[PDB]
């Protein structure tokens, strides 16, 4: 399957509720490690990574992330100055990572942002940094003179893929798991709109379609957002908003498609608290 390794760094100059610098690591967008400037320690967040990497791994990861905190602390005082902002709460964000498909092909990105808006981002096809404003052009010129793209690209294509492959091995049972949705048709009261609810699934790709008389029907449909549950799984719902007289004169069904599986619900399935 397709698997990814990503790191997201949240740095904050003048906040209160959170550490100055937070680092989260994810395989398939699921946390497997954490680090922050309060603990100054990088710790495990999944069993497969703790069973499979000893004290030496967590030591050198903490070292690297204390380097990341310092570089952030300096980095944010400059971008404030370039933007003429000597007062306030400001954020510095960094996210990079890997992708490995079935092809054997690979993809990667390396991106920074200031106050929640694109600052610089790597194009490792051309070994150049895309600046999003004048204030970033100063960094583009500096890093391109310094071979930062050379290092970052070596990381994304080799080092991060090597670590990714070990991680899909360590976590092969969880990471390759395929869990079906539990699907229900919901109704608050006999005239209410009707809701197709799908929950408990992984991976996150789901399709929810409504049907009128056996054919797909995209009128009066409100597809809800992809939301997470408390385990690695996700949920999503869709709502058909038609008057139950159109319910009489037609046969509406919900169809949920996930992985190699398909589930179907009709008016006979409607559950309710009423």
């Amino acid at each position: 399957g397709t698997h990814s390794l990503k790191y997201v760094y949240t740095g904050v100059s003048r906040g209160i509720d959170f550490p100055e610098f937070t680092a989260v690591g994810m395989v398939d967008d699921g946390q497997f490690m954490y680090f922050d400037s309060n603990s100054m320690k990088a710790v495990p967040k999944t069993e497969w990574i703790r069973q499979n990497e000893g004290a030496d791994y967590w030591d050198r990861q903490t070292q690297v992330l204390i380097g990341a905190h310092q570089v952030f602390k300096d980095s944010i005082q400059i971008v404030m100055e370039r933007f003429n902002q000597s007062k306030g709460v400001h954020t510095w964000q960094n996210m990079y990572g890997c992708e490995l498909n079935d092809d054997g092909t690979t993809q990667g990105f390396y991106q920074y942002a200031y106050d929640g808006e694109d600052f610089v981002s790597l194009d490792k096809n051309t070994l150049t940094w895309t600046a999003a404003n004048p204030q970033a052009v100063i960094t583009k010129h500096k890093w391109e003179a310094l071979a930062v793209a050379e290092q970052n690209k070596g990381y994304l294509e080799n080092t991060c893929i090597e670590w990714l492959k070990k991680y899909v091995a360590y976590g092969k049972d969880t990471l390759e798991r395929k869990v079906s949705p539990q699907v229900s048709l919901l109704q608050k009261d006999p005239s209410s709109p009707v809701t197709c609810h799908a929950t408990g699934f992984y991976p996150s790709g789901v399709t929810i379609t409504w049907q009128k008389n056996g054919q797909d029907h995209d009128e009066d449909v409100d597809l809800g957002e992809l939301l997470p549950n408390e385990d690695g799984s996700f949920q999503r719902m869709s709502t058909l908003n038609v008057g139950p007289d159109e319910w009489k004169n037609n046969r509406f069904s919900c169809v949920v498609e996930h992985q190699d599986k398909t589930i179907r619900k009709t008016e006979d399935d409607i559950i309710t608290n009423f």
Binding site: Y7, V64, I138
Partner: peptide
């Protein structure tokens, strides 16, 4: 495993 934060902006 995380990469070096190599150079400040």
């Amino acid at each position: 495993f995380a990469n070096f934060c190599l150079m400040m902006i």
